[PDB]
Swiss-Prot record, chain A:
Disruption phenotype: Increased prenatal and postnatal mortality, growth retardation, and multiple tissue abnormalities. B-cell development is slightly impaired, without affecting B-cell function. Mice however show a cell-autonomous early block in thymocyte development and impairs peripheral T-cell expansion and function. Conditional deletion in germ cells leads to abnormal sperm and male infertility: the cytoplasm of late spermatids appears swollen, preventing reduction of the cytoplasm during further development into spermatozoa. Essential component of the volume-regulated anion channel (VRAC, also named VSOAC channel), an anion channel required to maintain a constant cell volume in response to extracellular or intracellular osmotic changes. The VRAC channel conducts iodide better than chloride and can also conduct organic osmolytes like taurine. Mediates efflux of amino acids, such as aspartate and glutamate, in response to osmotic stress. It is found in: Cell membrane; Lysosome membrane. The volume-regulated anion channel (VRAC) channel forms a trimer of dimers, with symmetry mismatch between the pore-forming domain and the cytosolic LRR repeats, a topology similar to gap junction proteins. N-glycosylated. It is linked to Defects in Lrrc8a are the cause of ebouriffe (ebo), a spontaneous mutation that causes male sterility. Spermatozoa present in the epididymis display severe malformations, mostly of the tail. A drastic decrease of the spermatid population is observed, whereas spermatogonia and spermatocytes seem moderately affected. Defects are caused by decreased volume-regulated anion channel (VRAC) activity in germ cells. Oogenesis is not affected but embryos derived from ebo/ebo females show early developmental failure. This is Volume-regulated anion channel subunit LRRC8A. The lineage of its organism: Eukaryota, Metazoa, Chordata, Craniata, Vertebrata. Ubiquitously expressed. High levels detected in the bone marrow; lower levels found in peripheral blood cells. Highly expressed in pancreatic beta cells. Heterohexamer; oligomerizes with other LRRC8 proteins (LRRC8B, LRRC8C, LRRC8D and/or LRRC8E) to form a heterohexamer. Can form homohexamers in vitro, but these have lower conductance than heterohexamers. In vivo, the subunit composition may depend primarily on expression levels, and heterooligomeric channels containing various proportions of the different LRRC8 proteins may coexist. Interact with GRB2. Interacts with NOX4; this interaction prevents the ubiquitin-mediated degradation of LRRC8A. The chain holds residues 406 to 456 of 810 of the full protein. It comes from Mus musculus. Belongs to the LRRC8 family.
Protein backbone atom coordinates (compact mmCIF):
# COMPACT_ATOMS: atom_id res chain seq x y z
CA UNK A 1 0.00 0.00 0.00
CA UNK A 2 2.96 2.33 0.59
CA UNK A 3 4.32 1.54 -2.88
CA UNK A 4 0.91 2.06 -4.50
CA UNK A 5 0.16 5.25 -2.55
CA UNK A 6 3.63 6.77 -3.03
CA UNK A 7 3.71 6.61 -6.82
CA UNK A 8 6.79 7.54 -8.83
CA UNK A 9 5.32 10.87 -9.95
CA UNK A 10 4.55 11.99 -6.39
CA UNK A 11 8.11 11.35 -5.20
CA UNK A 12 9.50 12.96 -8.36
CA UNK A 13 7.49 16.10 -7.61
CA UNK A 14 8.61 15.84 -3.97
CA UNK A 15 12.27 15.87 -5.05
CA UNK A 16 14.10 18.91 -3.66
CA UNK A 17 17.54 20.52 -3.84
CA UNK A 18 19.76 20.39 -0.75
CA UNK A 19 22.34 22.94 0.40
CA UNK A 20 24.94 21.54 -2.02
CA UNK A 21 22.44 22.14 -4.88
CA UNK A 22 21.67 18.55 -5.83
CA UNK A 23 18.54 16.43 -5.89
CA UNK A 24 17.48 15.19 -2.45
CA UNK A 25 14.49 13.17 -1.24
CA UNK A 26 13.32 13.37 2.38
CA UNK A 27 11.41 10.43 3.88
CA UNK A 28 10.11 11.28 7.35
CA UNK A 29 8.10 8.92 9.59
CA UNK A 30 7.15 6.71 6.64
CA UNK A 31 6.51 3.04 7.37
CA UNK A 32 9.16 2.14 4.79
CA UNK A 33 10.89 3.03 1.54
CA UNK A 34 8.54 2.79 -1.48
CA UNK A 35 9.83 0.67 -4.35
CA UNK A 36 9.03 3.60 -6.66
CA UNK A 37 11.69 5.62 -4.82
CA UNK A 38 14.43 3.37 -6.21
CA UNK A 39 13.28 4.25 -9.74
CA UNK A 40 14.53 7.85 -9.33
CA UNK A 41 17.88 7.35 -11.05
CA UNK A 42 18.34 11.14 -10.96
CA UNK A 43 18.29 11.15 -7.15
CA UNK A 44 21.60 12.06 -5.52
CA UNK A 45 20.81 12.28 -1.78
CA UNK A 46 18.43 9.98 0.10
CA UNK A 47 17.29 11.16 3.54
CA UNK A 48 15.47 8.72 5.82
CA UNK A 49 14.08 9.89 9.17
CA UNK A 50 12.11 7.81 11.69
CA UNK A 51 11.43 4.91 9.31
CA UNK B 1 33.39 21.27 -11.40
CA UNK B 2 30.55 20.28 -9.06
CA UNK B 3 31.45 20.03 -5.39
CA UNK B 4 34.52 22.27 -5.53
CA UNK B 5 35.22 25.20 -3.20
CA UNK B 6 34.87 27.75 -5.99
CA UNK B 7 33.82 31.28 -5.06
CA UNK B 8 34.13 32.82 -8.54
CA UNK B 9 34.34 31.81 -12.18
CA UNK B 10 36.57 33.18 -14.96
CA UNK B 11 35.06 35.82 -17.23
CA UNK B 12 36.84 34.15 -20.17
CA UNK B 13 34.89 30.90 -19.71
CA UNK B 14 32.44 31.93 -22.44
CA UNK B 15 35.17 31.92 -25.10
CA UNK B 16 34.61 28.23 -25.88
CA UNK B 17 33.45 27.41 -29.43
CA UNK B 18 32.00 24.02 -28.39
CA UNK B 19 30.37 24.05 -24.94
CA UNK B 20 26.71 23.53 -24.04
CA UNK B 21 24.69 23.49 -20.83
CA UNK B 22 25.39 19.77 -20.32
CA UNK B 23 29.12 20.37 -20.82
CA UNK B 24 29.35 22.33 -17.56
CA UNK B 25 28.30 20.59 -14.34
CA UNK B 26 28.37 23.17 -11.54
CA UNK B 27 26.09 24.18 -8.69
CA UNK B 28 23.70 26.98 -9.60
CA UNK B 29 24.75 29.36 -6.81
CA UNK B 30 28.19 29.96 -8.35
CA UNK B 31 26.93 29.56 -11.93
CA UNK B 32 25.50 33.11 -11.90
CA UNK B 33 28.55 35.00 -10.60
CA UNK B 34 29.93 35.21 -14.15
CA UNK B 35 28.79 38.07 -16.42
CA UNK B 36 25.30 37.56 -17.89
CA UNK B 37 26.51 37.83 -21.49
CA UNK B 38 28.47 34.56 -21.49
CA UNK B 39 25.64 32.74 -19.68
CA UNK B 40 23.14 33.98 -22.27
CA UNK B 41 25.48 32.94 -25.09
CA UNK B 42 25.72 29.48 -23.51
CA UNK B 43 21.92 29.31 -23.41
CA UNK B 44 21.83 30.46 -27.05
CA UNK B 45 24.10 27.53 -27.94
CA UNK B 46 21.63 25.21 -26.17
CA UNK B 47 18.82 25.62 -28.72
CA UNK B 48 19.95 22.64 -30.83
Amino acid sequence: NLNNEWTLDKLRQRLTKNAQDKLELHLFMLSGIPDTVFDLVELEVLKLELI
Amino acid sequence: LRGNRLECLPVELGECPLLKRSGLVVEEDLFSTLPPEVKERLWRADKE
